Structures are given as structure tokens and as C-alpha cells.
């Protein structure tokens, strides 16, 4: 849909939620990242990706040093929080209140 490509086409006063939803998606969808694997000494069988490298739909980090623990700044956690926040806004919208 053209609005999905450019949220500015959606007039706020006509479709408030949908414009917000489009902006939420375009802003918080995760960012692909990359990491290496294998050994350059042995070569690699990658065809399109440069050899000994792998692509990854989410952002990634090197392995942590000390003990792990739940965190709240990862991309996925951010995606979860914003998504929930949006739907809460939806539930409180006038459309639900009438019914």
C-alpha cells in the first residue's frame, strides 16, 4: 500500500491508529546484522555472502564475559514493549469504548 511506503500520506484525522501503526513498524522493525564463522585457513562455501561470514536478521553482539542476566535494551525487547504500548493505545481508542 502507498501509505505503508510513506506514512505521511495517511491523514492523522482520518486514520489515527493506522498512521501510528505504520510509523511504529517502520521505526522499530529490527536491523539485520552480520558475523563470521569457520576458519579462513580452510576456506568457505559461501556463494553470495563473502566467505566465512553469515548474515543475521537481528543485531548481534560478541559473547558476554561474565554471568548472563535478563536485560531490557535488546532490539527484541524494544520491539515487544513498543508493540504492547501500541495495542494498549488501540484498546483505549474511541472505537472500543463505544462497545
Amino acid at each position: 500500500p502507498p501509505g505503508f511506503l510513506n506514512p505521511q500520506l495517511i491523514n492523522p484525522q482520518q486514520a489515527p491508529l493506522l498512521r501510528a501503526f505504520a510509523e511504529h513498524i517502520r521505526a522499530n522493525w529490527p536491523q539485520p546484522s552480520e558475523f563470521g564463522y569457520g576458519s579462513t585457513l580452510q576456506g568457505s562455501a559461501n556463494l553470495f555472502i563473502p566467505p566465512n561470514r553469515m548474515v543475521y536478521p537481528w543485531p548481534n553482539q560478541p559473547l558476554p564475559r561474565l554471568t548472563v542476566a535478563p536485560t531490557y535494551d535488546s532490539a527484541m525487547s524494544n520491539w515487544i514493549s513498543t508493540t504492547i504500548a501500541f495495542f494498549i493505545r488501540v484498546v483505549n481508542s474511541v472505537n472500543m469504548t463505544a462497545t
Binding site: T40, L41, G43, P50, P51
Partner: protein, 411 residues
């Protein structure tokens, strides 16, 4: 890794065109296969097993020489930034994966022939952008340049640090004990050829030491009596076939490290190298190191052919210039034998005998090559062997300086 290289195409010996046959191309680089690591596919342990004695490619170096000439006609992108065609053949793709006849619909521009063309990586940006896959070109271009720069033997570089060998190299060498030089050269070529590597890698240091040890033993300074950390090379008897050497490790007294880091460039001054496997293997092995680490310094122009005078990024005459030495195998052999007698490995009677045998052996090589040249005159359009004159077999070159360097290199 190493994101840049410089190169120089071959020289035409008065001939108007690059000296190779279509059959040579179809033979040595055809089949739509990748030509970028084939230099060892047609080498073996010794001349006895190879078809170097007759017909086309009738010399040890012949195939590699032809390869270098072949590349000189197709490396235009590193000179003019564009892929071109020559005699109806060109690269299949911008990655220069392989060669093929030109398409009929949109042929690329025809290459304008020239010689001794300087080459820069920066002229062809797609190379760096695809460095991970186009890496093998770096090695071969370097090798071609190292040969093109000199008449007679190719040029290669030597160096020895002030530190002892690291343990990694020690362990690595202890696994290559009984290996002949030819097999060792393949591994070095294989290593640096197929994927980018950093100069701070164990193999790089390992091969660097090998070239040093080979030369030190070649000069006869390194022997069963005196060794580098226990290692040294052993040469076959001149009475049968001296063109062979293998690695050895021994109880002998270990040579002390030099007072200061030593390094220089080397080449064989006499045509014998064209048909002598230890020279070819040694050069290729040593050149492999410079391929991955680049040239440490500009080469001295003082003793090079005319076309090599003042080549950008390659040769110089200023302060930051490393001298290049050269030698003739026969005087070198005499020096090696003399060192053996002084070390007490042999008697004076044997030393005289060894000189007679080696001289007789070398004579056959000269006799074979000189007859081979008239069988393949360079005016025929292809150069299977580099041209030379009869007097070239008699040059002593800088041999005295060479052994002096080894004297200072392994104290």
C-alpha cells in the same frame, strides 16, 4: 590483510607482440577454469618425472614464463581501469574469474599492445570491493612482476630478525623435516594464494625463515656442523643430480643471531636457473612471502636491465633502498664446498672432486639450454625460454658479496 599491490608487465625482446601462442593459452589456462593458482599443477619432485626435456615447454621455467607473458596481455584493468580483449579473448566477468572468447553482441574494446606497463590496484576499484574473492590475483601479479623486473633469474627477498624463532614456527618446521624443497614450495604458494591473510600470521613467519635457511645452506654456511636452531638443508650429490634438497634437523651447534637485522634482494645472474628446480622453487617460495606482506622497500636500480630503471613503487636509488645481490651457481657451489672443508665435513681431495662433478653437471645444463634456444628462436612469436648470450654462463656476478651476506646473516 593487504588492500593494495603494484605490478609491472613483461618486456618484449624487440618483438612487436606478447610472445605466446593461442595453443599455449588454450593449453595452460583454457577449459574456462580459474588460472589463478596453476603455477604448481605442472611441477613435481624432480626433472626426471617431468616432460621438460623436449617439444613445447622444454625447460623447467618454460611454463611459468609463458604464464607471465600471457597475463601481460590481459591485466589492463589495473593499468587503464577497463577490461579489454586481445585476439578475440577476454575475461568472462568483472571479477576476472576466467577467460573466454569475446561475445558477438557487445565486444569489449580491443587492447592496445604495450610492454612494461606499470600496474596499480587502485585503478580498478571493484577489486578492493571484492577483495575476499579476488585475492589470488594479488599473488600471481606479484610473482609476474618479480620475474619481469629482471633478466636471467627472477628476484626475491631475504631477511632475518634479531629474535629467535617463535615456538609455532619451530613446531611447524619439525613436521616438515623429510620434505623435499619442491613440495615445500607448493604449500607456501598454496597458502598465500587462496584467501587473504594478515602478515602477522604464523605461516608468514614460518616461510620467511625457510627462505633464510635455504639461502644460508645454499651458501654452505649452514651445515651439519652449524645450523639455525637445529635446522638446515641437505643437497644431493653432484655425481648424480645436485638439483635437489631436503630439510634436516640436527644436533649441530646453533648459529648465533646477527648483531642487527639483515635483509636484501637476490637473483640468479646466470641462465642456469631456467632449467634448475631448486632455483625456481626457492624463488617462488620466497616471493610468496613478499606477496602477502608487500615489498619492504624499493629495490636498488643499480644492477638491473634498462626497462627496470626507476619503476614507480618498485625500484629506486634514494636513501630508503635495499641493495640486490646476485650469484652464479658454479662459483656458489665452489664456495659451499670450500666452507664444508673449513668446517671439516670433507677433505681437500673431496672438495676438488666435488668441484669437478658440479662443473660437469652444470655444463650439461648450459649445453641443453643453448641448443634449446636455437630450436625455439624468439622470432617465432612465442618465448618458451628467456633469451641469453653464450657469455652469460661465465659471469661471476656478486657471488663474493652474497656469501659475505650469509657470513653476516648467520654468525
Amino acid at each position: 590483510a593487504q588492500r593494495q599491490f603494484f605490478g609491472l608487465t613483461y618486456n618484449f625482446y624487440g618483438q612487436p607482440a606478447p610472445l605466446f601462442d593461442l595453443n599455449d593459452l588454450q593449453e595452460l589456462a583454457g577449459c574456462y577454469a580459474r588460472p589463478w593458482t596453476s603455477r604448481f599443477s605442472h611441477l613435481a619432485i624432480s626433472t626426471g618425472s617431468l616432460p621438460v626435456w623436449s617439444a613445447r615447454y622444454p625447460s623447467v621455467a618454460s611454463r611459468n614464463i609463458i604464464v607471465n607473458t600471457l597475463l601481460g596481455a590481459h591485466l589492463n584493468p589495473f593499468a587503464g581501469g577497463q577490461v579489454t580483449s586481445h585476439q578475440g579473448i577476454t575475461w568472462r566477468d568483472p571479477v576476472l574469474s576466467s577467460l573466454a572468447p569475446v561475445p558477438a553482441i557487445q565486444p569489449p574494446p580491443v587492447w592496445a599492445v604495450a610492454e612494461n606497463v606499470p600496474l596499480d590496484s587502485n585503478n580498478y576499484p571493484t577489486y578492493v570491493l571484492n577483495l575476499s574473492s579476488m585475492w589470488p590475483i594479488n599473488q600471481d601479479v606479484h610473482i609476474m612482476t618479480m620475474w619481469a623486473l629482471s633478466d636471467q633469474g627472477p628476484i626475491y627477498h631475504l631477511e632475518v630478525p634479531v629474535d629467535p624463532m617463535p615456538a609455532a614456527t619451530t613446531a611447524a618446521l619439525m613436521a616438515y623435516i623429510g620434505v623435499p624443497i619442491a613440495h615445500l614450495a607448493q604449500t607456501a604458494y598454496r597458502f598465500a594464494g587462496q584467501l587473504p591473510q594478515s602478515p602477522d600470521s604464523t605461516m608468514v613467519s614460518t616461510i620467511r625463515w625457510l627462505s633464510a635457511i635455504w639461502f644460508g645452506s645454499l651458501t654452505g654456511r649452514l651445515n651439519r656442523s652449524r645450523t639455525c636452531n637445529g635446522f638446515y638443508f641437505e643437497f644431493a650429490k653432484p655425481a648424480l643430480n645436485p638439483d635437489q634438497a631436503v630439510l634436516k634437523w640436527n644436533d649441530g651447534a646453533r648459529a648465533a643471531p646477527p648483531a642487527a637485522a639483515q635483509s636484501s634482494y637476490m637473483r640468479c645472474i646466470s641462465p642456469h636457473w631456467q632449467h634448475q628446480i631448486v632455483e625456481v622453487a626457492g624463488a617462488l617460495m620466497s616471493q610468496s612471502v613478499t606477496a602477502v606482506t608487500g615489498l619492504p622497500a624499493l629495490i636498488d636500480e643499480a644492477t638491473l636491465p634498462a626497462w627496470s630503471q626507476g619503476v614507480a613503487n618498485l625500484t629506486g636509488n634514494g636513501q630508503g633502498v635495499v641493495p640486490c645481490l646476485d650469484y652464479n651457481p658454479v662459483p656458489m657451489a665452489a664456495a659451499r664446498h670450500l666452507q664444508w672443508r673449513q668446517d671439516g665435513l670433507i677433505t681437500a681431495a673431496q672438495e676438488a672432486q666435488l668441484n669437478n662433478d658440479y662443473t660437469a653437471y652444470a655444463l650439461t645444463i648450459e649445453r641443453h639450454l643453448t641448443a634449446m634456444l636455437v630450436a625455439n628462436p624468439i622470432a617465432a612469436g612465442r618465448m618458451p625460454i628467456q633469451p641469453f648470450n653464450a657469455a652469460d654462463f661465465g659471469q661471476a656476478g656478486q657471488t663474493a658479496a652474497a656469501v659475505a651476506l650469509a657470513q653476516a646473516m648467520f654468525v
